[PDB]
Each structure stands twice: as C-alpha cells, then as structure tokens.
Symmetry: C3
Subunit: 308 residues, 3 copies
C-alpha cells in the first residue's frame, strides 16, 4: 500500500475528507470502538515548539485508540541537530506506527514524509493547521448539517496557518471560503491557487477581500484567529492597527446570516481579533470546536493507519 501522510488539508480528496469527517462523528459517539493501536503500539508525538493543547488532544486520542503516545518535546536536542532528519525517520519507523509532528517550515514535513515508512501527520505548522480545520468542519456539520454550499468567512491575518487551511480544507468540503484581510497580509499565492483549483472540483469558490463588512454579509460561519503568532512578535510590524477593522465583534456578526456560528482556534486574545460578547454568546461554537480536535484527530489516525 502507498503510505498516506497528512501534511496539508488537500492531502485528502473531497471523498476522502468526507470519510474522515464521518469517522470523526462515529468516534465522538463511540470513542473506544476503534482500537487499531491496541498493544499498545507506539505513536511518536514530536514538538519542535511545545503546544500543550495539541499534546493533550493527541495524547488522549492515541490512548483511546489503544496506543501509547511517546511525546518528544522541544527541549530534546531538536530534530535535525544531533542526527539527520532522515536518520530519525528511519529509526522512528521501527518503533511507532505513525509520526505526529509540530514543526515550522513545510519542507521539514515533506522531508520526513518522503523517508518515513509510517504515516506522518502535521499536528500544526507555520503554513497549515490541517487537524484544526478537520475539527472545524466536524463542528460546522454538527451545527448545520451538509457542508456543501455553506458560506464561510475568515477575518484577520490572511497568510497564517488557519487562513491557508480553511481555504484548502474548506473548499475540499464544498464550502465557499472568503478571506477578509488587509493588504500585505494576503494568502500565499501557491495555496490560493491550489484552493481555487480544488474548489473547481467541488463547486466551491475562493474569495479574498479587504472589505470585512462585505465578507460578513450572508455568511453561515465566521472565523478568526490571533493576529500574531509567537514568531511574528519580532517581525517589526504594527500588528494591531491593520487588523482592527477585521475584529469579529457583535456588529460584524449581526451582518451575517441570522443562524451564523463563530469559530476560533484557541487561544483567543479577547478584545483584539474577537470580543467577549461574541466568544461567549450563543453563536459561538469555539468550545465544541476545541473538543472536536480529539475526535477529528483520532479519525484521521484510524483512517491513515488502515490505508497504510
């Protein structure tokens, strides 16, 4: 069998994404019904930069599949330093049944996935957050039913990992995705072109705009995320003034469809990209969205393991 990896959202075809999302719903209802890692078989969960939320979700999810997550945190000689990345993929492929990796540049994920003989999953990277978007789509489906034809709008930094993954994973689900972002903060051209091509296969569409009010009008789902990652705090930019018109506040939510829901990859900086009234009001799905990381990541693992 070809070893399948999940490094970016378009790694799943539209039909394959639907299978994973269906499995996520079944695992949410019966969370110990699938035990492909019974033994326990090991899964490596590797952090180039620590992420407590990602670790909790994967550590527990892997255990509920029967397995044992072996967590390697950032303070451990760093992948690439004491050994080549390819030496590491070679030995890890003897110990564990899958490799879950939080890292920085996409080229590192690609390099690992080209030599590892077990599935590699991008837990979170600078360019994509594919597992969060699987959880997002699971949450939207719980609240709204069929994903096909929904209109989703993302606000804020249009070139961070969530904007890119909502583009790719959203159009893979048949969702019309709009990114509202100020000039200079637009999606990467390669990602935008991949999303446009993928949207052709599903009947979806990609829109990029600097008009937040237009992006909010008629939306079924409004999404935002922090305006600045930890790496960007030293980039020299004023990263507040450009984004203030894109704040997801009560006024912006009122422009959307009356049944609209709100998503946000946690943590939120309340008062910046989103307000308290929105975060804790009735349209917020952020808490279900956080919980669903567990189920969507378990489903992705079950799916990749049985294909590999």
């Amino acid at each position: 069998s070809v070893i399948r990896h999940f490094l970016r959202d378009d790694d799943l075809s539209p039909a394959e994404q639907a299978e994973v999302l269906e499995l996520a719903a079944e695992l949410k209802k019966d969370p110990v019904s699938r035990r492909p890692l019974q033994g326990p078989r090991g899964v490596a969960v590797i952090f180039d930069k620590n992420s407590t939320r990602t670790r909790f979700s994967f550590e527990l999810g892997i255990a509920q599949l029967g397995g044992h997550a072996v967590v390697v945190d950032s303070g451990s000689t760093q992948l690439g330093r004491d050994e080549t990345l390819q030496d590491t993929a070679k030995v890890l492929s003897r110990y564990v049944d899958a490799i879950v990796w939080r890292t920085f540049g996409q080229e590192r994920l690609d390099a690992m996935a080209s030599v590892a003989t077990v599935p590699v999953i991008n837990a979170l990277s600078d360019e994509f957050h594919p597992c969060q978007v699987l959880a997002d789509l699971q949450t939207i489906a719980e609240r709204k039913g069929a994903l096909r034809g929904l209109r989703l709008s993302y606000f804020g930094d249009g070139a961070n990992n969530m904007a890119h993954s909502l583009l790719l994973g959203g159009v893979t689900a048949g969702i019309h995705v709009t990114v509202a972002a100020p000039e200079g903060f637009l999606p990467d051209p390669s990602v935008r072109a991949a999303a446009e091509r993928r949207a052709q296969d599903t009947g979806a569409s990609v829109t990029v705009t600097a008009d937040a009010h237009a992006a909010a009008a008629g939306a079924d789902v409004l999404v935002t995320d922090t305006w600045t990652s930890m790496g960007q705090e030293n980039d020299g930019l004023d990263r507040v003034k450009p984004f203030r018109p894109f704040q997801l506040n009560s006024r912006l939510l009122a422009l959307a469809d009356s049944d609209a829901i709100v998503l946000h990859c946690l943590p939120a900086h309340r008062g910046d990209e989103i307000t308290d009234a929105v975060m804790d009001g009735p349209a917020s799905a952020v808490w279900d969205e956080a919980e669903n990381r567990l189920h969507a990541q378990k489903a992705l693992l079950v799916w990749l393991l049985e294909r590999s």
Copy 2:
C-alpha cells in the same frame, strides 16, 4: 452536584470516613475500581512542580483505568495564554477531573467555581489535604479507630500540613495540638474553622509553645520541614526525648522529604514508631479513593 476537594473541611466527617474506607479497600485490591476505563483523561496541573504528587497521581489514575495528562509549571502558570475560565471550560470537555498544584487558594477557588468536573488540590501554599487523607489512612491501619486519638504536630504551625492536620484531624474526631514558636503559628481563619468542626465531632484544638506538653500522652506525633533563620524551631525537633513522653505504641508521621538532623532525627525516623514509609505509599491509595469518590458523585 460537582464536588471539589480544595481543603480538608470540604469533606464532612461522614464523607471523610467514606473516602478513608475506600482507601483501605483500594490498598487491598488496587485495580478493582476502573471508573476511568477508556482511558478517560484526568488533568494533573502544576503551577510549581512536585515529583511526589505527580508520581502518586499518575500511577493512581492509570490503576483506575485512566490516563493522566500532566501539565508542568512551564506550560501551566494557569493564565499563561488564555483566561482561567477559558482553560476550565475546555478541560471540562477533555477530562473527568482536574488535579492542580498552585500557590494561593484564590487561584484554586476560581477554577472550582467554573469547572464542571471535580477539582482537587494536590498541594497548596495553605493546605495539603491529600497528604492528610494518607496520614489518616496510615494512623487507622496502625491504631484502629481514629476517634479519640491525640495527635500533635510540631514545628512550623503556619504551613500547609499544620492547617490540614487541624482541619482533617478534627474532621476524623482527633484531638489535634499544634506546637509552634510564636512567629510561626496557625492562620486564625483556619484555626476557628477547625475549632468549629471539632464541636461537631468531639475533638479539640490546642496551640502551644510547650513541646514537652504537646508530646505528653500523644498517640501520633507529626512534623514537617521547617523550610540562622532556623533558630526558633529546634526546641520542637521531634527527637527521641519528645517521643519518650508519648503514649506507648505512638506513631510518628512526616510528609516527605525529611531533613534528617533538623526537624527530626535518624533515631526517630528509622525507629519502630516511624510510619513515614507507609504514609508515603498511602498517598497513592488515598488519592485514588478520593478520585473514585469525587467521580461517582460528580
């Protein structure tokens, strides 16, 4: 309906007796109760690390069928990157209980007011209630019934063990004495709090600088680390002289680690009255009992 255990008086006398009975059953049959089979998760969070607390909870949760997700001080500082309540609301979807080691109580109190799973104080700057459950289990297995026993704590009466021996001790019906120098006395709000549960159980609270008098007739002698800034405690050192004043077959307890030669001597630590090794082991069983009991009511 969502019960927390942040202080020893969070349990009534009848409820404490329930937990201690369950700790004895779990010591005998350590894998017979599996309320976390799955595994279901339990968060174990440290604002400051405690290897002893982590070791005991990690193994115990696993023996209850679950999986402890340990978050160290570096990742915690609860409030690090999101509000406390934002953290409590998500944790309540992932885990079935939250075990937390933090400094002040006000931090503990907030978490418990919002979380929708039980919150447990693993160790605080003011209370160490799980250790006292392990102490009461250790006393019961060596002395029988707790009610009517005389326990004396020696040394720093202003630290977490002194506060928890007062509250947990009187809750079990034990006459508790604290022997401490004037500068290092119990917190007044804990003292009156202990003084009030003692009325319900027939126990009592005494605070003296008289170590000789606190040791005389004692059935259980307890001390703890003091930390020359360490001058006022050495008349309270639990040595062979003080112990010789106690009741026959008295036992000695000490939340570990012990600094041998300071608050306690080798002769007492390694002698026949010492129960400190069983006491340390019983954190495992008493904490499992506390978890089992909190989980089946919450």
Copy 3:
C-alpha cells in the same frame, strides 16, 4: 534474592543467553508477556536526559502492561532533598523496578544495595549494558551463534560502550578487541574483569593501537562518538588522536567479507564513521537501534521473574 543489572557481567553467561533468547521471543511477540499488568509502575529516572533511552523504555514498559513514571533531570536531582536510601525505600513501595540513567557507578551500587526491587543501569559514564544486550541480539540475528565471533571496537577505549562491549562480549563468548590510541585505553579494573570472565567462556580480550590489525579477520566492527557531552570541556584535542581509528570503507574491507558494523546512536557522520559504511550493506545500526526496545523488555521480564 533481588537481582540487579548495573553492568554487563551482572549476568552469567547462561543468564545472558536466557535474556537474549527472551529478547528474540519478545521481538516476535511484543505484547504476550504482561508481568506489569495493572498497570504496575516502573520508575525511569534521568540525572541527565537521554531521549533515546526514555523513548525505548517508556514504550517497552507499556508493552509489558506497565506504566513508566519518568523523572527527568529538571525534577530535583536524586540525592539533593533526601538521601538515595530514603528515595529507594519509598520507590520500592511504588514501582516494581527502578531504571536509572546516572553518572558514577557508586550511585547505582548504593541504590541497588537498599532497593527491594530490581535496579537497572539504563546508561552510565562507565557502562551502557542495555545497548550491548541490543548489540548482541543484533549480531545473533545477522550472524547466528555468538561464541567464537571476533568483534573489534574502535575509538575511545574508555567510554561506556567499550567497557560494556568488553564485559558483555566475553560473557557471550566473543573475542573482543579494543583499538584505541594511547591514553584512551579501557579502565584497568574493567579489562581485568573481562579477562577473568573470558576464561569461563573461551573468549579473549585484546587492546591495541593498531587499527588495521584490529580490523583484520573481524566479524563485527563497532564504534561510537569520540566525545561525550561531559568530555567537551576536558581540555583534550579529541579528534586528532582518533582519526586513524575511523570506521571507513578501507578499514571495513580488511575485515571478514560478511562483517557487520554497529554504532550506538547518535553517530557523527564524517568523524568516527563514514556515510558509505553507515548506509552500506554491512551496517546493522538500524536494527541495533530497534533492538534496544526488545532487549530492555527482555531484561525487565527476566529480572522481574527472579525477584
């Protein structure tokens, strides 16, 4: 009697054979032995962290049904806030074995003299006995019987791998050669213990500075990094003396034609070993890394059986 494994010769030749046989059985059936079902705990303690050691022990203990409680170097170092004796006594009530990565051998000895559960040396300054069990497992699967084999180690003759290959190798009946430059020779006490144990097994011990002679006729070539982290500030040029001892293609071609190459990872490609040797058909470094898992499980199973 409570058995410990602090150095390679803590197992007799017959006992080592039992552990190696178990390791082969566990590699075929990794979850069929559950002596730690419960889970019962095993303490895995690091005075200095070793990701490879923690990784392999953590997974291996889980596959025995147990739960590894890992105590890293961040946690207050053992012996600081209480006596090793005090810690040993309490650990003996919490876990069924103690796995410890520490520095001096006297610390391991002190722990094993007091603990009432088996103590394992996961890795120390003087010995790496678990890695050499994995090495012997690897040689057996690629060569057959171990008795009569000729193994040569190259590089720093006084590091933990050289000492354990000496002791564990002769216990298995292997003729062990250490090729090392002057001033980097095996500890005299370790060499004499190996020579004594060799008299029971028909093995032999050789120490030489002639790398070419050490490689001629060798069935197994082994090397290791030239410098541990605690040696980076020792003041020595730790490259120039070892250059003639590099495991390279020329050196390997002097050995027997089906010789295999071992190396405790990490390897510094270009220094003690070349890319062509690490990646060629004689290299067994990848199976050797994997066998840490199986050999350490076997050792735990065997120690728990007898304690």
